[PDB]
Ligand binder design. Structure first.
Ligand SMILES: Cc1c(F)cncc1-n1c([C@H](C)Nc2nc(N)nc(N)c2C#N)nc2cccc(Cl)c2c1=O
Length: 819
């Protein structure tokens, strides 16, 4: 039976476990073994969780950063009770009324129950007011009634049990460039370099020119200007093979120490990766395609059986003005006064690490000595220390320790970045991986998105091995969740097949007939079973039950993305949800953008500013494949501004097209609120697109909800890849209630944008650190530091608050006149 588990893991993660064994790699063998035990311990520790502690695992509380209707029922019968509680009351008080009424009806304690949202994997519990749970707030703003279900602890325990599995070497370092066998048309050079992060340990050495028609020989010694004893634990030997008369050919990196801290000897064949000159941030593992990849055979001198010194023998061995790059005389000053840093400037650790002589072991030993006695840093400081610019393992481990105090909501917000950092790791076994795995096994919602973040990039060879092992390890921690995720993969597998059929059919057949054929294909037994009854990959708390084939369709645009609607006779209206399956686009940029907008939303509302944003879900699931959450009861600006006849939004002037639409959806007194929702949401996405630099904003990639809420879609383009600010007049026409003159509901809108802009400025370092880590993703519009510089200037983080606010209004003033 252990085999089927092994078999469905292989099917799930998208690569056979036999391939792991086929490598015969001791490092791989150690990773799988060591973490299988760790995840199985967490599995046995998880199930020791009491029934309440189990709720916190499987269904973590969804909290947002006067009376109301609430109906509640029990699991046994479908007979219901509608109570009238306040938004102040605890779920306990509500459960008390539910039991008391049940008593009265049937014959005649609340702590033994939990409130489940109808038809969703979301629960209401704890000592929180009802208006703290986001489901209740979602009902308050929608005007719907919260339908809850009294779930006893005995059935919750049933849910639990059902998921059941030397400094002596002072001679110069050097190598032996032997052979390899390439491809080009001239002469050829091999430039090698030693790196500790993004900067060199010493001066790079180049090979001697050797003819192209080769498969060559060099057998040339490359002596580096650095002692062997001074090689840091995380030193990288980076090669660069290129032709010259400059045409780059290939690159390859290598650690000088294995995962067992042993100095490497001797000969090694380096299967290089194609290029675009040195690439120090690249992977340290060779090209898996050993058939086509050019190799580079080197040899490492036997300098003795030496290992990198244990930490125990390492421990043996004008500033405030320049606190906001640095000059050499300033670096000297920071390093000289390094003890005062630890004592009085604890969070200035990053700066102190950047002035540390990493090419000299004595300076590193002293630095590591201070780090071992260094006070815990805030989350924001630790996020910076995760970057590749701090490649030392003990530093990366220290940053992890400062991130152990991450709340699950914080971790969820930063998870995308933390996963991309795994690409900076030099070894499979690292503190970051175990932290991610540990938190994923403690929180099913974290584990859900951790999986899909790894599974989405299994098509990428340089991370296929690492991500595949981590997912396998997680599966050991929960065989049940593995089955749940596998149900999601089978649905996505059918959607892929369905979309291929739609793509082909729509090119040789009209849309209505294609949509008709789409329906017939979906009505197949294998499609009905695969696409139904599953946890939405976009949101595991959202259940996708019965698929409404009649409500399913596709768009006439390039990739013909699918529109799949769902319904549930258990969730009521909260079950009528939809997903958008798109195949062909790199949805990674949309996910990042929407996550950052979501972050802005959190930062705004925990300051008391609810700009009524619509951060819909967007999750890449495979190679240029992913899902997008359907925003119900909405429409694009362009479709509304079509001024379609025979309707209610038909206007005498195109200016009134959008305003007439709102009044048709919000009759009478309901209008005034829709105007506000529009005004708030407009100011939000406005500031959001300016900061993130989202250009190409037109009426086709901008939508509006019937409640009035304005929201943007299809973010392929951020960080100006320089974008001015984007204020069209028809939106202003709505904000000013239609009248051409309306200063106070416009200046108030102006105040909305400015406050929303200043709030993001104070959290500017958060956006800087997160984007810096996201450079590891390999996103085309986020690779160089000039993309980062854009965010610096959009937030004006080098300037004072009113200096930036003054400048912020300048472009605001420019946007209103070209309007
Ligand atoms: C084009 C369009 C429209 F004019 C009005 N409403 C919806 C559409 N529309 C859209 C729009 C443009 N995109 C979105 N629409 C909603 N409601 N929520 C979103 N999160 C997004 C997004 N991103 N995408 C599709 C993707 C596939 C198949 C179809 Cl069949 C449609 C489709 O119809």
């Amino acid at each position: 039976v252990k085999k089927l588990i092994n078999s469905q893991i292989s099917l799930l993660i998208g690569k056979g476990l036999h391939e792991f064994d086929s490598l015969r790699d001791p490092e791989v063998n150690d990773f799988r073994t060591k973490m299988r035990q760790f995840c199985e311990e967490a599995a046995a520790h998880r199930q020791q969780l009491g029934w309440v502690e189990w709720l916190q695992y499987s269904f973590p509380l969804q909290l947002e950063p006067r009376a109301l209707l609430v109906n509640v029922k029990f699991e046994g019968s479908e007979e219901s009770f509608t109570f009238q509680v306040s938004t102040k009351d605890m779920p306990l008080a509500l459960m008390a009324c539910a039991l008391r009424k049940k008593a009265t009806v049937f014959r005649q304690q609340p702590e033994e129950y939990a409130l489940q949202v109808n038809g969703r994997h979301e629960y209401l519990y704890g000592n929180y007011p009802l208006c703290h749970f986001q489901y209740i707030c979602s009902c308050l703003h929608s005007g719907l009634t919260p339908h809850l279900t009294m779930v006893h602890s005995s059935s919750i325990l049933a849910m639990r049990d059902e998921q059941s599995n030397l400094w002596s070497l002072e001679q110069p370092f050097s190598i032996e460039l032997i052979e390899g066998r390439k491809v080009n048309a001239m002469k050829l050079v091999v430039q090698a370099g030693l790196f500790h992060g993004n900067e060199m340990l010493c001066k790079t050495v180049s090979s001697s020119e050797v003819n192209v028609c080769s498969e060559p020989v060099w057998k040339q010694r490359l002596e580096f200007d650095i002692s062997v004893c001074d090689l840091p634990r995380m030193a990288r030997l980076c090669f660069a093979l290129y032709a010259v008369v400059d045409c780059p050919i290939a690159w390859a990196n290598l650690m000088l120490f294995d995962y067992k801290d042993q100095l490497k000897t001797g000969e090694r064949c380096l299967y290089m990766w194609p290029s675009v000159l040195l690439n120090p941030a690249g992977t340290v593992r060779g090209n898996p395609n050993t058939e086509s990849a050019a190799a580079l055979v080197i040899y490492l001198p036997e300098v003795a059986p030496v290992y990198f010194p244990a930490l125990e023998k390492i421990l043996e061995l004008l500033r405030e003005i320049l606190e906001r790059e640095l000059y050499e005389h300033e670096k000297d000053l920071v390093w000289k006064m390094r003890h005062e840093v630890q004592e009085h400037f604890p969070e200035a650790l990053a700066r102190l690490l950047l002035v540390t002589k990493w090419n000299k072991h004595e300076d590193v030993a002293q630095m590591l000595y201070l780090l071992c006695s260094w006070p815990e840093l805030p989350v924001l400081s630790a996020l910076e220390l995760l970057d590749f610019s701090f490649p030392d393992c003990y530093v990366g481990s220290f940053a992890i320790k400062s991130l152990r105090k991450l709340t699950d909501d914080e971790l969820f917000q930063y998870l995308l970045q933390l996963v991309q950092v795994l690409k900076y790791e030099s070894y499979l076994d690292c503190e970051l991986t175990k932290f991610l795995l540990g938190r994923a096994l403690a929180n099913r919602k974290i584990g859900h998105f951790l999986f899909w973040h790894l599974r989405s990039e299994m098509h990428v060879p340089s991370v296929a091995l690492r991500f595949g092992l981590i997912m396998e390890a997680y599966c050991r921690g929960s065989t049940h969740h593995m089955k749940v995720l596998m149900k999601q993969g089978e649905a996505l597998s059918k959607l892929k097949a369905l979309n291929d059929f739609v793509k082909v059919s729509s090119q040789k057949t009209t849309k209505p007939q294609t949509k008709e054929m789409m329906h017939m294909c979906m009505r197949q037994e294998t499609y009905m079973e695969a696409l139904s009854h599953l946890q939405s990959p976009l949101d595991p708390s959202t259940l996708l039950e019965e698929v409404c084939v009649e409500q399913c369709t596709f768009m006439d645009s390039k990739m013909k993305p699918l529109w799949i609607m769902y319904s549930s006779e258990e969730a009521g209206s909260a079950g009528n949800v939809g997903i958008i399956f798109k195949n062909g686009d790199d949805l990674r940029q949309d996910m990042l953008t929407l996550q950052m907008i979501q972050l802005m939303d959190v930062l705004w509302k925990q300051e008391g500013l609810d700009l009524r944003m619509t951060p819909y879900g967007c999750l890449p699931t495979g190679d240029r494949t992913g899902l997008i959450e359907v925003v119900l009861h909405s429409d694009t600006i362009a479709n509304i501004q079509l001024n379609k006849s025979n309707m209610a939004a038909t206007a005498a002037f195109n200016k009134d097209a959008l305003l007439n639409w709102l009044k048709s959806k919000n009759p009478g007194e309901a209008l005034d609120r829709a105007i506000e929702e529009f005004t708030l949401s407009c100011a939000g996405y406005c500031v959001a697109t300016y900061v993130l630099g989202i250009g190409d904003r037109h009426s086709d990639n901008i939508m509006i909800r019937e409640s009035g809420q304005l929201f943007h879609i299809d973010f392929g383009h951020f960080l100006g890849n320089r974008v001015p600010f984007i204020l069209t007049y028809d939106f202003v026409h709505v904000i000013q209630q239609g009248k051409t003159n309306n200063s106070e509901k416009f200046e108030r809108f102006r105040g909305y944008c400015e406050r929303a802009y200043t709030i993001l400025r104070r959290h500017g370092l958060l956006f800087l650190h997160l984007f810096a880590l996201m450079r590891a993703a390999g996103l085309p519009e986020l690779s160089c530091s000039k993309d980062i510089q854009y965010l610096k200037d959009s937030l004006a983080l080098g300037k004072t608050e009113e200096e930036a606010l003054k400048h912020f209004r300048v472009k605001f003033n420019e946007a209103l006149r070209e309007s």
